[PDB]
Amino acid sequence: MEMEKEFEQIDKSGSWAAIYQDIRHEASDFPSRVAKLPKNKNRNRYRDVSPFDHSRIKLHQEDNDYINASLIKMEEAQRSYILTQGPLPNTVGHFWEMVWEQKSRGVVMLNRVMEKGSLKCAQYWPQKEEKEMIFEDTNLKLTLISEDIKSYYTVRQLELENLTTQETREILHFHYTTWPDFGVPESPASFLNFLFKVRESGSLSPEHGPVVVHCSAGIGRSGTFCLADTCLLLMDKRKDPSSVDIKKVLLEMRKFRMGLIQTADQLRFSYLAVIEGAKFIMG
Numbered sequence: 001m002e003m004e005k006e007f008e009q010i011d012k013s014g015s016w017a018a019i020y021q022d023i024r025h026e027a028s029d030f031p032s033r034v035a036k037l038p039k040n041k042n043r044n045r046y047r048d049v050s051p052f053d054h055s056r057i058k059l060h061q062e063d064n065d066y067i068n069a070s071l072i073k074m075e076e077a078q079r080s081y082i083l084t085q086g087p088l089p090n091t092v093g094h095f096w097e098m099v100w101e102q103k104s105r106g107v108v109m110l111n112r113v114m115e116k117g118s119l120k121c122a123q124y125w126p127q128k129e130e131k132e133m134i135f136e137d138t139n140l141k142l143t144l145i146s147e148d149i150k151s152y153y154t155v156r157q158l159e160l161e162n163l164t165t166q167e168t169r170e171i172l173h174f175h176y177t178t179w180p181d182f183g184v185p186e187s188p189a190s191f192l193n194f195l196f197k198v199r200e201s202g203s204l205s206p207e208h209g210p211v212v213v214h215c216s217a218g219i220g221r222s223g224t225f226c227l228a229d230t231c232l233l234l235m236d237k238r239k240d241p242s243s244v245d246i247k248k249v250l251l252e253m254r255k256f257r258m259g260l261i262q263t264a265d266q267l268r269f270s271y272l273a274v275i276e277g278a279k280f281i282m283g
């Protein structure tokens with residue numbers, strides 16, 4: 001079926017939970033043996049969210065190459081994304097090592113450091129220009145260059161220096177600051193505006209390594225971001241945009257990381273975002 005009318009048909013019939021459970025039943029199951037090794041217990045935020053072995057990002061290190069991060073490679077859309085958990089106190093150096101080694105331009109953050117009165121990820125970037133951060137375990141230095149605070153999101157320019165080689169690179173930090181502690185946003189308008197700002201920066205384009213996107217577990221809000229982006233790109237590329245099947249795209253993405261889209265409300269919000277986004281692209 002088309003999307004917008006499939007949408008109203010699920011609303012009128014109140015069957016979002018049944019649609020979402022079908023997705024969960026059909027999703028891929030692949031091994032995640034490296035994630036479950038005992039030496040990696042303090043590298044995982046949640047015991048039930050792990051990268052598959054076949055798609056995990058490897059650190060360029062011979063001691064321990066493990067990070068909770070997955071490469072989502074979308075062949076028809078010609079887009080790749082790295083989805084990862086929010087960094088932990090003992091993985092902030094690994095996180096920036098990955099950004100460096102994978103040649104990423106942009107980092108997309110969809111959570112606040114504290115939500116619901118608990119810490120959802122480490123404070124992994126500097127908050128003042130004159131107070132830089134040094135990660136001694138991976139030999140990187142990170143400096144805040146500029147910060148632009150808007151009503152729904154903040155964009156930061158960061159300098160990452162590899163202290164072994166003295167090479168430097170500019171990294172863009174795109175921080176969506178207004179996702180509610182509970183539920184999903186009422187309107188997709190600010191989320192779409194944010195997606196378009198990430199696109200306009202070059203961070204999603206083939207001349208750079210894959211964008212790094214995270215929330216707390218790296219599957220819920222993070223899944224919503226890449227699902228909406230890929231569906232809108234496919235609607236622009238194909239002769240028949242009504243052929244784009246968001247459930248099929250989601251199942252394709254779940255070949256590369258488990259659990260993408262965590263609730264039926266996130267599924268409905270993803271439909272809403274793609275539907276409204278497709279009108280603005282043209283109007």
Ligand SMILES: Cn1cc(Cl)c(C(=O)NC2CCCC2)n1
Pocket residue numbers: 232235236241242277278279281282
């Ligand atoms: C971004 N984008 C480009 C196109 Cl084209 C569309 C789209 O969904 N078009 C629909 C019109 C009614 C049926 C298909 N979205």
